[PDB]
Amino acid sequence: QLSKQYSSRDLPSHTKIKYRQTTQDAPEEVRNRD
Amino acid sequence: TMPKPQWHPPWKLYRVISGHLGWVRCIAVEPGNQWFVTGSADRTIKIWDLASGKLKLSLTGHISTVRGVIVSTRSPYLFSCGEDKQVKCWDLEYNKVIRHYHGHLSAVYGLDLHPTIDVLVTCSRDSTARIWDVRTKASVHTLSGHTNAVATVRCQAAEPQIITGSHDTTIRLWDLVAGKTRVTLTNHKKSVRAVVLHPRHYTFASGSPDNIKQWKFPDGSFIQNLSGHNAIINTLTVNSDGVLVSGADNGTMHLWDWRTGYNFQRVHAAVQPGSLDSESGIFACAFDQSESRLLTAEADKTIKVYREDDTATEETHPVS
Amino acid sequence: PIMLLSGHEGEVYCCKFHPNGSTLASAGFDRLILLWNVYGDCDNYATLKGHSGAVMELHYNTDGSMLFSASTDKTVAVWDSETGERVKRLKGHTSFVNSCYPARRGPQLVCTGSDDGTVKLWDIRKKAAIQTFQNTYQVLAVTFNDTSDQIISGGIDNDIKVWDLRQNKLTYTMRGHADSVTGLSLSSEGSYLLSNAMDNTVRVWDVRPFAPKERCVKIFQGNVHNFEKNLLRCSWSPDGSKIAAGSADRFVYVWDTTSRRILYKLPGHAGSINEVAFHPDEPIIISASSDKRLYMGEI
Amino acid sequence: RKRKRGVDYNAEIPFEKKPALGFYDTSEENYQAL
Amino acid sequence: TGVHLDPAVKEVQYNPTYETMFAPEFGPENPFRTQQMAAPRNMLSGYAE
Amino acid sequence: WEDADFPILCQTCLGENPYIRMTKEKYGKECKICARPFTVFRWCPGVRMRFKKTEVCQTCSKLKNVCQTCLLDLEYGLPIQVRDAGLSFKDDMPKSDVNKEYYTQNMEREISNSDGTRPVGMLGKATSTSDMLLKLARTTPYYKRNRPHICSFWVKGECKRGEECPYRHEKPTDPDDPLADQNIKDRYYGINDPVADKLLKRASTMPRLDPPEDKTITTLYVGGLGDTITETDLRNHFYQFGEIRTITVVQRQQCAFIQFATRQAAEVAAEKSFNKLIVNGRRLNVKWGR
């Protein structure tokens, strides 16, 4: 029982996840750090 | 009896931050350990420096009490959750909300993040939890089955992947994929507002005004009690060295030994000048990333920082 | 493990090993030839292209250096396993060329069975035909004799036929199968030859200088046919120990040369098994079935 | 006759939950009338 | 007895031999089962594959 | 919404050719009972037979154990009321709107936890097929079900479509007949379906062995014995069924007279054997002797 209604706010948006880059604080560095 | 507990040094208060205009209800530390973030009942989110205690920034989007914050270890995101039934995703390269998760039917009491996959879990007062997809804002599961507000949720990578404690005095261990409860633990007599997972031991503990209890994964087999703290317990927080902090709602804070369950310190801090004495209470506590500092968020609008005491020894402070 | 392979769009009719036991070739309706590595994860490196019709039979040389592949589009093809590229398009076949066989250890020479009514002998270098024995009708499978001097063929009239390359007459005709023969494969003995036929019976024969004049040796039960009349193919083991057959019953049939017992009727498939391949080194089995994928059984 | 949920009271057990069964035979039990 | 497989178990990761795969089950067949309850069934009225 | 792998249908209704071609439509129609949307499968029964369609949910089927379009039972194949009576079942499925939608919701939630293998509930606890059920069962496929309807035009004369008249251009059945008006809802719920009553009267008029008056008449006459039977064979017919006290195998009339040791044992034996004790192919007639 799936509706075909819809919403202005369920349009696609921010469809890519940012990942924490090499210098910002990647889980590798924090795995290292003291 | 028991073998005898390991000796841990005791902790002493060394800083008192005060800039909030309502109770402080949640606290969290960044991955890289430079700043922490507090959310309060004055509907702001303040971001403080962890070395100096200076306030860096103030984010104001919510409409009511912010009851949980968390900072994601994989992406530059801060997820906040309020009593306005709304859950937000702040992107910390612009300091602005970019995503909002809709669908809860009453205040959201707490929230946790999955450590490997990109999902969110939120618990609310409609007595459900929801598993959100971080990227498409779509609710992939509504974990239902409690019969009263769901006070707390914690999630892990191992199995079972979600533990919720609720106000109908029950704990449930759920599976993330199937989306239904494997185990129901009914040992507590009063609301379970606090749950914590040991970092390196496949065990967990759950706090209630009766007593804290320890349980053993993955089907929650009872292990032992921890008694003595007779107070509404708002938080539990475990160090990697087996220190377990139990913060109550009348202000008193006990520090225990995790393994043997021996309460080695009791802190009863003082209320900020202009406060009543009926307004001492701890709502959240968080260990630093180095596990050296212990920050607490209190009902007198202050943040108190404890550090370990370096000039004490087994003979100065013996273990009973 | 079971190791089921997929990546073929339509039926796979033919699957066989490198005579090294290094690489895998499979082919069928999709009009192209897929290759894999037998070991590791059974992974796919190369895909040969070009054949417009269905690849009805692929055949190696005995070193593994060039590839023969009979196509529905009236043509055989020899390609370079070195490259995968065409060296020769054996055209001239007047109909559906279903079966191909390269001469082993002799001069490079090929016998092709076709749906024209002829068996054709070809030299790879000349781009011309050598010999052609028009009996009357379609020939469905063809294999040489280890002297490279007789040629055996099986078609619709149930009498397995063998021609002498020098006198060019029907050397040896053998009889006893009740319906159409669908597969021949001469063991590495150079002597014992295996015949599948959809009448539900498999037979064993032996081409020698001297044979008892009626060389119907061993007989096994089990194979099936149905409304499909798909082409059913058999093989010997590297040792002449086990015979493997497929059938339209979804059951891989593994029998023995010795006791003719049913060592296996293995399930696992979804559509008819068209070709079973034995590893020249190992106890490894590869099933090509009409369910658009393959199996890698270990026994 | 047009009322959707009315006869949900006098015709049938409104939402019937039959008792669970345990370690004893409830079969022969039956009760009197008024 | 040697290795036999559970006939109700269909997900079989072992390469079974002829006897090791189709070994017959001992006993009498329950006279209480209609044709429907006697046949092997994935669906309510029959196996379908 | 339901979602299935295939219909679940009577062999009569599925057709004659071994090779059938059938179309599926996801969320295609509404179960006339479950009231919710279903997937609807449509097949051509045979040459010059109407396309049939699955007309009830897969759950509404598994619950009462019937054929999704033929509606008759799955093993025996009688109307739902007849099968219920022969199994002595009491099916408590609600009738009013709200109660029925609620019952359907929870029954579906509980059937989600099944194996898809056998009906849920008493339809497993009532599979003891009584000889009445086996006796009423259909034998060969009554394939008159799949012929087309009656051409209103060709009943008035008008079916000017030549031979292609979309309905059997025969005589319309007299509407007075009880076998005319059987609404789907009742035929599923089993409340006052005329075919059920006619078949039940037929089963009541069917021959079964009669009981005597006196308790002391414990000799049972089996007529039509034949000289291929033994006294030990008549025993094996009436030996473990209780105890037999004596056996007179009358060869001058090809009959037998069994004196028993328990009245209920002999009664069960002979009634259960009535014309149907088929030992060595002989129609013996089990009755109580003089």
Next chain:
Amino acid sequence: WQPPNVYLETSMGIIVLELYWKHAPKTCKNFAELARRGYYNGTKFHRIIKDFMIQGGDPTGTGRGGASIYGKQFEDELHPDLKFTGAGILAMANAGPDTNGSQFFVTLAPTQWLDGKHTIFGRVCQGIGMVNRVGMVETNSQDRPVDDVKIIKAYPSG
């Protein structure tokens, strides 16, 4: 060596079965050697037909296992007058004559159908109400009932 009453204290109740060697010497010896052998510990009831049969004793628990004291199996030792006319007749069932192995059956009622195909080899002299209780239990569609009912102790008469 003919143990009078072989005691097989199942989980669900005690049992001891009396085997008539005079009618069934081979299967009486086989079953005694098995019960004293202790190999029956762990055998789950591989078939339970309500009011018909309880059949177990399979080292697989599926029905394609089981071995006898003379190898894999042996022939049947038939009796002319011993039958399955009543409950508890302990007769090792077979899927084909001369192939009776470890599998054990116990009647629950007259089973005049199993006469001639299974050699009635005794009767259960202990625990018949328990036999009825195990025969009432609800089973799956494969007669491996939902309850994994096993024997605690397998041993013969002294």
Next chain:
Amino acid sequence: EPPPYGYRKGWIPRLLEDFGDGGAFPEIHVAQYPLDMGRKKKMSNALAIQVDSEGKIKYDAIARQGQSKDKVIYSKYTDLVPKEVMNADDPDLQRPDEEAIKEITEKTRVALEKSVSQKVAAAMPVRAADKLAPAQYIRYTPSQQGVAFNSGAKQRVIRMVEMQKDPMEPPRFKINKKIPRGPPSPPAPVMHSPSRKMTVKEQQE
């Protein structure tokens, strides 16, 4: 008692007292009912009084009412007792090795995201309608076997083809129906510690 073996001829045991310690007489052409044997009884509701692998009465059954065996049900006193796991060392309690964690993460990711994809493709609703998958072939073994049905073949082979959806067609059915929520799950047993007493004075307080 029961007459001797070989000398049990002549007597037909009708009351189970003739069984002595029990036993059926296979040579006696009577249906032996020894110690409640033989007689098919009424179908009663009582569920199977099970017993554990030591002869204890597994009352876990009545709490586990109508539930799988995946459910872990704590209902015994021994579940309350403090296990002595005051050990910093035991390899019993240490998290699964990160390789197994990687396996669980991959599997979860898969199932999770596919269900995501369907739920969000619902939020597409403008479905970029893809073609209907190729016609499937399913082989069907009816339960009823009989030469007079299926014209004498014990199988049927059927070709599934999915019917085209009309692009311009509005929804067909009313979605919004309200009903009360179902019964929950079987109540779990309340494993508390024993209650203590409140004096009159405390209730005054």
Next chain:
Amino acid sequence: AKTVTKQRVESHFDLELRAAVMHDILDMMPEGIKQNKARTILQHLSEAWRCWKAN
């Protein structure tokens, strides 16, 4: 599940405040076992507020 906008800010504040109060003690610092009267402690809460406002 309608959002909290601008006309429901006050009514919602009071919803959540008295839900919190009911969680808080009247079920987690009880031992007024019989019937913990939480419906009357809420009356005290509202009256304490009016008394604050009236000084």
